[PDB]
């Protein structure tokens, strides 16, 4: 569902980019990730570690769906489920959620 | 100046 991520432990709402990097740098591990709401309308970021570096990917909420690049999904939860199964960046998949404390 | 993974 459209707002089902609001009770997912990997979703951190208005966590800042710096706060997200701090969390990802505590015990660095390729495949670690969290999702945050950006300070732009209808915009989220996946913050993650892949191939030894920390990166951020923008996700757009467009009407009822979400878009990552050219790929559309029904919802953020569906997007995250897909990228647990198929690579998000190079060969890295979402594997180790950083949970809200 | 936030750097993100390139679009597309």
A85's tokens: 């199964």
* Angstrom distance (rounded) from CA A59 to CA A83: 13
In terms of Cβ atoms closer than 10 Å to its own Cβ (0-12, 13-18, 19+), residue A17 is middle
Give residues with Cβ within 8 angstroms of A97, minimum separation 6.
Answer: A9, A10, A32, A33, A34
The distance of Cα A20 from the centroid of its chain, to the nearest Å, equals: 10
* Angstrom distance (rounded) from CA A65 to CA A60: 8
Which residues of chain A have a CB within 8 Å of the CB of B5?
A: 55-58, 89
**Coil, strand or helix at A7:** helix
* Angstrom distance (rounded) from CA A23 to CA A96: 12
CATH number at residue A7: 3.30.505.10
Chain A contact probe: residue of B1, B4, B5 with most A CBs at under 10 A? B5
Helix, strand, coil percentages, rounded to 5, for chain B: 0, 0, 100
Resolution (A): 1.5
Given an 8 Å threshold on Cβ–Cβ distance, is B4 in contact with A89? no
Picking from A61, A66, A55, the residue whose alpha carbon sits closest to that of residue A89 is: A55
Domain of residue A96 covers: 1-101
A53's tokens: 């570096």
Instruction: Tell me the three-class secondary structure of A26-91, residue by residue.
Output: HCCCCCEEEEEECCCCCEEEEEEEECCEEEEEEEEEECCEEEECCEEECCHHHHHHHHHHCCCECC
Number of structural domains (chain A) is 1
Closest-CA residue in chain A for B5?
A57
């Amino acid at each position: 569902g459209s707002h089902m991520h609001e009770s997912k432990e990997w979703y951190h709402a208005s966590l800042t980019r710096a706060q997200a990097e701090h969390m990802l740098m505590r015990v660095p591990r390729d495949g670690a990730f969290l999702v945050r709401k950006r300070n732009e309308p209808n915009s989220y970021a996946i913050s993650f570690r892949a191939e030894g570096k920390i990166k951020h990917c923008r996700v757009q909420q467009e009407g009822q769906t979400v878009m990552l690049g050219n790929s559309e999904f029904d919802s953020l939860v569906d997007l995250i489920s897909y990228y647990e199964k198929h690579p998000l960046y190079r060969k890295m998949k979402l594997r180790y959620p950083i949970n809200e404390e | 100046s936030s750097v993100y993974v390139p679009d597309e």
